[PDB]
Design a protein around this ligand. Structure first.
Ligand SMILES: Cc1cc2nc3c(=O)[nH]c(=O)nc-3n(C[C@H](O)[C@H](O)[C@H](O)COP(=O)(O)O)c2cc1C
Ligand SMILES: Cc1cc2nc3c(=O)[nH]c(=O)nc-3n(C[C@H](O)[C@H](O)[C@H](O)COP(=O)(O)O)c2cc1C
Ligand code: NA
Lengths: 104, 103
């Protein structure tokens, strides 16, 4: 099972849903992460240039895939093969973003 | 005000999340719809041919758009300009489905 995060489209993309796999991988329960930007998964050794490419792609609602260093609730690092894509309505308005961690 | 439904990929695609717009449009609260297939939104006047095209698309994990007749919680019918797509991991495995109603 691949981890999945769903966020609102605007206002710094607060998380609105995480799947069971996300909780298994990261050690966070939904109530711990709902309403927060997913950046809390990053840590001291996360690559700033990768984070910058994510920031630019999401701002422009452009799909992006990056291998990024993240951290579990307990502080242990894990590699995240991360794919983020906008969810659009038929007018092209962005309704949400979906992030998937591919394991592999 | 675009409604959104997210479901599991397998085993009759039970709803795992609906956005605020969904509850506004349909009159259903999240806890009323979670764990259920979205087909409860359908009713007597719903076009069976439209439902069959959705069934075949979802079964094959093909993106599809249909104008389908749906029913609010209070039994009032509304037109759902519905767009469904699979969410895939980078292996191509289907992780979930997302349905959007365009207003
Ligand atoms: C739907 C979605 C899922 C995301 N998932 C992750 C993730 O799993 N790990 C991660 O480090 N960042 C993730 N992000 C990225 C952060 O939320 C943020 O966009 C990124 O750190 C770049 O912006 P910043 O420079 O403001 O932090 C995700 C973003 C979105 C929109
Ligand atoms: C993510 C997702 C969202 C859906 N949203 C709707 C909806 O808003 N209205 C609707 O009538 N059917 C919706 N469906 C379709 C039904 O769940 C079901 O697939 C459809 O009725 C055809 O299958 P059946 O013939 O087994 O009912 C959705 C399906 C998925 C996977
Ligand atoms: Na991925």
């Amino acid at each position: 099972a691949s981890g999945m995060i769903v966020t609102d489209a605007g206002a710094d993309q607060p998380i609105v849903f995480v799947n069971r796999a996300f909780s298994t991988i990261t050690g966070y329960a939904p109530n711990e992460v709902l309403g927060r930007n997913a950046r809390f998964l990053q840590g001291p050794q996360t690559d700033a240039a990768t984070v910058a490419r994510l920031r630019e792609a999401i701002a422009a609602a452009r799909p992006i895939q990056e291998r990024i260093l993240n951290y579990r609730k307990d502080g242990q690092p894990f590699w995240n093969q991360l794919s983020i894509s906008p969810v659009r309505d038929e007018t092209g308005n962005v309704v949400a973003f979906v992030g998937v961690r591919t394991d592999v």
